[PDB]
Design a protein around this nucleic acid. Structure first.
Ligand SMILES: Nc1nc2c(ncn2[C@@H]2O[C@H](COP(=O)(O)OP(=O)(O)OP(=O)(O)O)[C@@H](O)[C@H]2O)c(=O)[nH]1
Ligand SMILES: Nc1nc2c(ncn2[C@@H]2O[C@H](COP(=O)(O)OP(=O)(O)OP(=O)(O)O)[C@@H](O)[C@H]2O)c(=O)[nH]1
Ligand SMILES: O=P([O-])(O)O
Ligand SMILES: [Mg+2]
Length: 1095
DNA sequence: CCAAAAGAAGCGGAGCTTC
């Protein structure tokens, strides 16, 4: 414990006494931090970090000598050095702003004088920065080591923070704003996704600062200072960045949107550097100069990422030995630049790739206001992905003369749901544009003869990339489909690419050529296929054609099939057997493939099946209201409007309804994962309205080209044959929009009744300003809910089976109840420690608990079994970081603003998170982990969760391994895993100790609505133990089913495309049997095994 | 549904209050 002497030697002039018991001003920086046993930062001990690092960055030799290494990144050249010189000068400006801000803070309200007289301003939420000041005559000034080091972190953050931010979707923006997801204005998600919230900006900034400070937290110090001082610094640096215009602050007024929303929300956007700014080619020189082990860097050649010890954002969950092996294997993979695609991207140029793959140049007078904002979002994502690719290409290009021989490695970590996520936002795994330029897939193929197996593999790669559904047809039929396409519609695009692969040039009309040839086949991988096929055509040696073109072994309706296999817990039914075959589990058909299944046996997949069931359920709803003309008319109107704008809905001339797989895909999936119907309804309406806003632009684009054209032949000309036919379409639209906004269905005692809203749509349409408002969106949603979504939900249950629904409900309940108790106990143990600290004279309110105190509390919850263990994976469903534990500001800036709430790592309610956690985890997550670690694991692949990109040389073996990995994951029992955790929970829980809040929440999950009223502790305890029994019985069933199935002859082709199914070689032959016969025999084996447990 | 949370600011020195 010589840590007091150590840190005082480094900072002896900081104000106050490094004794928490001392009576005057106490220094909480020295009380909170210690020197690390091994150096973490090269700026520790430096009198002037900004001067030292600026000299370090002034030349290659100085950089190498400062980093104590023989050779620096070759990207650090003359042009990049000059840019860092200017950036170091800017750091001096930031530091100068910070010093002036401190001076003003000390002068305002005589704070400096009071602090000098003994007022403990260094313990205030806005004064924790006084812990790193030094006395300077009659005033105070920053410690220069600490100030300048924080500024260096500020500069690194400024350069790379945007590229490390998370992606905000509709759910995120809803959580941030307090506006219900379904009523979110258009472009609001775009506004919020492009910016950072305060917590988002400050916490990432604070993380950097503390990292560069290079010290270690004292476990016995209050989090109010260990987390508070760097956050205080981060907040002042953000404020300085706003003054300097490096960051823009936008306070978004929610009452402009929703008048009863009082929230005003800060949004921080970093000012973008030029795409051609040399600093982009090497944006981490500071990071790599300051830190002994840099986080932010690219991994070239034999420089490989280390293996993460803990789950992403779950410090309490250690990656298992099997997970770590998976991570090592994926980080070992070498990725390479495919030069022809980069050259193609470069030659088209940013502007043309925007025109082709985004929305091109937008003129804000032929575009609907709402549609214009969606198109701005489409352009942004493509643009950022392009710039990020070429920044990476600049760095790669410096490493060698031939860029295609520089190996690239990527860091991965295991997420909470057991997925191996590639770190970063613009890597091969996450960005489609990058995925076609940087690849691990490689093959040398003999394409000199089109009857080769090599040429067939090549064809499969091409067909899949061009939107041919390769898993639905045999290789032979596939081959003819591709040939027709290549020799037909794609031919003029192919001729252009031939010419590009000869001269390096593209014609002025390149975008038109590609757009016309590809149609709705257009994608980045489609461009890769045209590039690769044209390369083969001009290839000197077709006998040894080298290509990164891949085939994706892709999961067929993966999550739902996984759920059906992993969590169905009773006897076998013939419907289950038929429905699971749609996902590639074949019983009694040796060597059967998904290609064969879809072409000869059953052309309907699981989502098509559920759509078929929706059609049946819709008829049944129609018949219950046959005499009710207003009701029949509402239904007709909802269907009409959907038909008018959505591709997956069709109505024939005599009113025959046709539905495609695509409308059931997401609803089915997210229903299993616990979504409500309202959320599904809102999403279907969003897709309708987006199409309407898009059509409004098509109208303006018609009125400009032709002023004397009718609104009927402006909105429905491309959709209808004649003008009268376009007039009947327009009449339908106005009829539908009026009735669907003015009238809503309401469920009154199990009956549907129509009610007037009093807020129906009327008035002349102005295509530019046209917006379907919140009250009118609500009405469309309620119509969608009762007339489409509810029937879809009935259809969904029929398809996946009631037994699975029952299993997922029990899983949800157990995990929610357990999470409620963990949350509440933690909060109580925290409240009990704070009442104890209230007696401590050294302790002040605002100081929280120490890390050791929080670790003690977290470890005291272990007998409630917060972790689910599978033997190869660990899940912690309750785990979160939230502001509700400390319920207090952590730090503010020196203007009393940027008040960051204190966030704590603690358990919180799961809600429905247990279902997707366990299904994704033990489904696709376990499959991929197995695939990474299994005997003869496929090499040189890219894994994207439920599909794996494979080099053309290894498509057969890798697919068969992938299907084997699927079978392996189907030997799991997530309910058993949940049961084992919940059973331990149940012997240690004391429901009496819980708060009325916690008790109420458990009541909702464990009890029927008519029993939450007067529920005793003993009532909800008996109800909780009944769920334990239910879990036990389900887990037993799943266990038997899996054993029974292993004895039968099985062909597995869930990871489809190639036609390489895994054979389990089960010795009981169920060939030449109907599903009814198979179910009867499996059930005989079930009972046989069930009677074995009896004895 | 899930894969990461997330109002601002005056006055005063925490936490209530107004927008
Ligand atoms: N919780 C959640 N999971 C999703 C969602 N979308 C996709 N997933 C998961 O990712 C899996 C694979 O996604 P996809 O390949 O796009 O869809 P799929 O279910 O395999 O269906 P197809 O490939 O079209 O046959 C799904 O089965 C889900 O488990 C979603 O919106 N919510
Ligand atoms: N849990 C979860 N997984 C998702 C969700 N959406 C997509 N995924 C998974 O992530 C993968 C993304 O791979 P991409 O090839 O980039 O496809 P995408 O990002 O979904 O874009 P699309 O081509 O429209 O499917 C999908 O195949 C799914 O496996 C989601 O909402 N929740
Ligand atoms: O094009 P698919 O059949 O691999 O999805
Ligand atoms: Mg899939």
């Amino acid at each position: 414990e010589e840590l007091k002497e150590g840190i005082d030697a480094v900072y002896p002039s900081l104000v106050g006494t490094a004794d928490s018991k001392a009576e005057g001003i106490k220094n909480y920086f020295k009380l909170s931090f210690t020197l690390p046993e091994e150096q973490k930062s090269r700026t520790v001990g430096s009198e002037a970090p900004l001067k030292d690092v600026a000299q370090a960055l002034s030349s290659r030799a100085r950089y190498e000598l400062f980093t104590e290494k023989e050779t620096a990144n070759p990207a650090f050249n003359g042009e990049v050095i000059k840019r860092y010189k200017e950036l170091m000068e800017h750091g001096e400006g930031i530091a100068d702003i910070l010093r002036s801000r401190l001076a003003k803070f000390l002068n305002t309200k005589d704070v400096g004088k009071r602090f000098a007289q003994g007022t403990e301003a260094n313990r205030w939420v806005g004064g924790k920065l006084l812990n790193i000041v030094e006395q300077d005559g009659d005033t105070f000034k920053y410690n220069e080591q600490l100030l300048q080091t924080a500024v260096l972190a500020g500069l690194q953050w400024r350069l790379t923070a945007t590229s490390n931010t998370a992606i905000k979707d509709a759910k995120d923006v809803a959580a941030i704003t307090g506006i219900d997801q379904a009523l979110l204005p258009e472009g609001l998600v775009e506004q919020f996704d492009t910016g950072m919230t305060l917590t988002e900006a400050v916490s990432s900034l604070a993380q950097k600062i503390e990292s560069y400070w290079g010290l270690s937290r004292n476990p016995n110090a209050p989090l109010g200072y260990t987390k508070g001082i760097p956050t205080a610094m981060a907040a002042e640096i953000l404020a300085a960045f706003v003054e300097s215009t490096d960051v823009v602050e936008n306070i978004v007024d929610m009452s402009e949107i929703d008048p009863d929303n009082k929230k005003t929300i800060g949004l921080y956007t970093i000012t973008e550097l030029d795409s051609f700014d040399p600093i982009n080619s090497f944006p981490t020189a500071i990071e790599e100069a300051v830190l002994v082990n840099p986080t932010e860097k690219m991994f070239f050649g034999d420089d490989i990422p280390p293996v993460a010890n803990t789950q992403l954002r779950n410090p309490a969950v250690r990656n298992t030995p099997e997970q770590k092996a998976a991570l090592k294997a994926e980080q070992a993979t070498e990725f390479y630049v495919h030069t022809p695609m980069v050259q193609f991207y470069e030659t088209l140029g940013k502007d043309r790739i925007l025109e082709l793959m985004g929305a091109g140049t937008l003129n804000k007078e032929l575009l609907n206001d709402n549609h214009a904002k969606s198109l701005e979002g489409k352009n942004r994502s493509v643009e950022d992905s392009y710039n990020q690719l070429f920044s990476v290409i600049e760095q790669v290009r410096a490493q060698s003369e031939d860029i295609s021989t520089v190996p690239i490695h990527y860091a991965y970590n295991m997420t909470r749901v057991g997925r191996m996520q590639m770190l970063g936002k613009y890597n091969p795994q996450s960005a489609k544009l990058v995925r076609e330029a940087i690849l691990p897939t490689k093959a040398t193929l003999d394409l000199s003869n089109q009857n080769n197996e090599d040429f067939s593999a090549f064809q499969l790669g091409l067909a899949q990339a061009l939107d041919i559904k390769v898993h639905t047809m045999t290789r032979e039929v596939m081959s003819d489909e591709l040939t027709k396409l290549l020799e037909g519609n794609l031919k003029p695009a192919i001729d252009m690419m031939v010419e590009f692969n000869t001269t390096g040039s593209l014609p002025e009309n390149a975008v038109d050529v590609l757009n016309t040839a590809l149609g709705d086949r257009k994608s980045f991988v489609a461009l890769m296929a045209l590039m690769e096929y044209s390369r083969y055509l001009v290839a000197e040696d077709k006998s040894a054609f080298v290509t990164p073109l891949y085939v994706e072994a892709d999961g067929v309706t993966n999550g739902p099939i996984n759920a059906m296999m992993l969590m169905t817990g009773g006897l076998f039914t013939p419907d289950w057997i038929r429905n699971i075959a749609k996902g590639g589990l074949f019983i009694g058909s040796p060597n059967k493939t998904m290609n064969e299944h879809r072409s000869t046996a059953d052309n309907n997949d699981l989502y098509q099946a559920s759509t078929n069931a929706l059609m049946e359920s819709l008829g049944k709803l129609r018949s219950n209201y046959a005499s009710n003309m207003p009701i029949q008319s509402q239904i007709d109107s909802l269907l009409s409007l959907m038909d008018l704008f959505l591709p997956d809905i069709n109505l024939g001339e005599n009113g025959a309804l046709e539905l495609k797989r695509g409308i059931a895909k997401n609803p089915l999936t997210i229903t299993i994962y616990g979504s409500g119907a309202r959320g599904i309804a809102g999403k279907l309406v969003s897709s309708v309205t987006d199409a309407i806003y898009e059509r409004m632009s098509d109208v303006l684009k018609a009125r400009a080209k032709d002023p004397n054209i009718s609104a009927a032949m402006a909105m429905f000309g491309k959709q209808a044959a004649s003008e009268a036919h376009a007039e009947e379409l327009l009449a339908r639209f106005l009829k539908d929009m009026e009735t669907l906004t003015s009238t809503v269905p309401v469920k009154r005692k199990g009956v549907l009744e129509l009610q007037s809203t009093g807020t129906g749509a009327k008035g002349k349409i102005n295509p530019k300003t046209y917006t379907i408002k919140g009250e009118q969106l609500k009405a469309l949603q309620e119509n969608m809910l009762h007339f489409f979504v509810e029937p879809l939900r009935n259809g969904i249950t029929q398809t996946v089976g009631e037994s699975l629904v029952y299993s997922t409900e029990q899983l949800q309940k157990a995990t929610q109840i357990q999470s409620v108790v963990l949350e509440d106990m933690f909060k109580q143990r925290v409240q009990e420690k704070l009442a104890e600290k209230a007696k401590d004279p050294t302790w002040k309110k605002g100081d929280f608990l120490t890390q050791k105190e929080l670790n003690d509390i977290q470890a005291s919850l272990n007998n409630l079994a917060p972790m689910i263990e599978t033997g190869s994976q660990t899940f912690y469903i309750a785990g979160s970081e939230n502001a509700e534990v400390a319920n207090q500001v952590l730090a503010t800036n020196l203007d009393d603003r940027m008040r960051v709430p204190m966030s704590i790592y603690a358990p919180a309610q799961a809600g429905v998170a247990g279902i997707p956690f366990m299904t994704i985890g033990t489904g696709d997550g376990m499959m991929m982990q197995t695939l990474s670690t299994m005997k003869g694991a496929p090499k040189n692949t890219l894994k994207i969760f439920d599909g794996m990109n494979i080099g053309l040389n290894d498509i057969t073996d890798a697919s068969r391994k992938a299907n084997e990995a699927v079978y392996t994951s189907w030997q799991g029992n997530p309910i058993k895993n949940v049961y084992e955790s919940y059973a331990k929970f149940m012997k240690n829980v004391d429901f009496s100790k819980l708060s009325p809040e916690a008790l109420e929440a458990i009541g909702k999950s464990a009890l029927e609505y008519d029993q939450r009223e007067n529920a005793t502790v003993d009532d909800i305890a008996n109800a909780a133990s009944l769920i334990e029994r239910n879990l036990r019985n389900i887990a037993l069933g799943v266990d038997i089913r899996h054993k029974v199935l292993d004895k039968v002859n099985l062909s597995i082709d869930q990871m489809a495309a190639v036609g390489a199914p895994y054979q389990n070689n089960g010795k009981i032959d169920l060939s030449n049997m109907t599903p009814e016969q198979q179910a009867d025999e499996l059930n005989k084996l079930f009972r046989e095994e069930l009677e074995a447990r009896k004895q």
